[PDB]
């Protein structure tokens, strides 16, 4: 089908290794940035501390709380509180989580992301459930407690983008390479005796034909074939990090087209 082309090399719940051909580098990169910064997610944006006899500071705990990945599957059915007509927050624009933990045992008591309890009405939307990729099913150690120790708090998880705070990135590293053979001459290699001998060969070199020494420089050539690998934090499935990345970018171009109309 028509323009840009995709070829999936590897795929799992956590990653997609794919080849993006018949595309401009401006597009490949704009797409790359959108997956990092602009795909909406759900994360803890407010913590009310009832009890903290823990060894860690309120704001230190509150910080890590925001860093816990939360289900963001059905995120477009949730409003940004700023657009929501409620006073403050509500089920149309937020998810409410509860955290009550006490040191019952003489041995150390660990507090996990599995211990947050959804207290608001999710209205059948797949949202707010802490992401657990742990084998023991605990996921994310928030805190540790001693005997008399207690932590009682309430969380308001809201919709947002990494551009506002990194906690909202469905993100994780985006492996990105083009022209593994430097045929384009986009980089001048630093060497001592031999750049070829001194620079390790890219795994992507198998997927491309070597330049061949008896050939003059291809001055007219342009980059089109981007070897990418998108890693997912958990909040959104990999296919979605890319699909919503495409969708978001498409959307923000449409807002320009609509802006031209308005004036």
């Amino acid at each position: 089908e028509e323009g840009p082309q995709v070829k999936i090399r590897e795929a799992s719940k956590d990653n997609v290794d794919f080849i993006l051909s018949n595309v401009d580098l401006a597009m490949a990169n704009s797409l790359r940035r959108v997956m990092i910064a602009e795909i909406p997610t759900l994360a803890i944006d407010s913590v009310e501390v009832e009890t903290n006899t823990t060894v860690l500071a309120d704001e230190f705990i509150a910080h890590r709380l925001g860093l816990i990945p939360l289900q963001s599957m059905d995120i477009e059915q949730l409003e940004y509180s700023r657009d929501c007509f409620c006073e403050d927050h509500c089920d149309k624009c937020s998810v409410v989580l509860t955290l009550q933990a006490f040191g019952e045992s003489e041995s150390t008591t660990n507090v996990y992301s599995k211990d947050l309890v959804i207290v608001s009405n999710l209205m059948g939307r797949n949202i707010g459930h802490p992401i657990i990729q742990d084998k023991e099913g605990n996921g994310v150690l928030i805190c540790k407690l001693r005997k008399g120790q207690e932590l009682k708090l309430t969380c308001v998880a809201k919709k947002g983008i990494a551009k506002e705070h990194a906690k909202w990135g469905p993100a994780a590293a985006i492996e990105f390479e083009y022209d593994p053979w430097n045929k384009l001459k986009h980089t001048d290699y630093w060497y001592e005796q031999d750049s070829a001998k001194e620079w390790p060969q890219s795994k992507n070199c198998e997927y491309e034909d070597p330049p061949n020494e008896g050939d003059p420089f291809d001055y007219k050539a342009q980059a089109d074939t981007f070897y990418m690998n998108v890693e997912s934090v958990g909040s959104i499935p990999v296919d979605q990090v890319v699909v919503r990345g495409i969708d978001t970018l498409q959307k923000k171009v449409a807002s320009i087209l609509l802006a031209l109309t308005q004036m």
């Binding site: 994360a43 407010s46 913590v47 009310e48 501390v49 009890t51 910080h63 925001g66 969380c155």
Partner: protein
Amino acid sequence: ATLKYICAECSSKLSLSRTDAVRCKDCGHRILLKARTKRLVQFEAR
């Protein structure tokens, strides 16, 4: 549970008028820490 002052030594919840000096009831230590508010503190998880 009208918490005013906790003992720094034994974690005993207690309280007394400025006419009852410092000290702890059933510990005797003169340390004492003030009780956390009930006002409740709100944080942005950033």
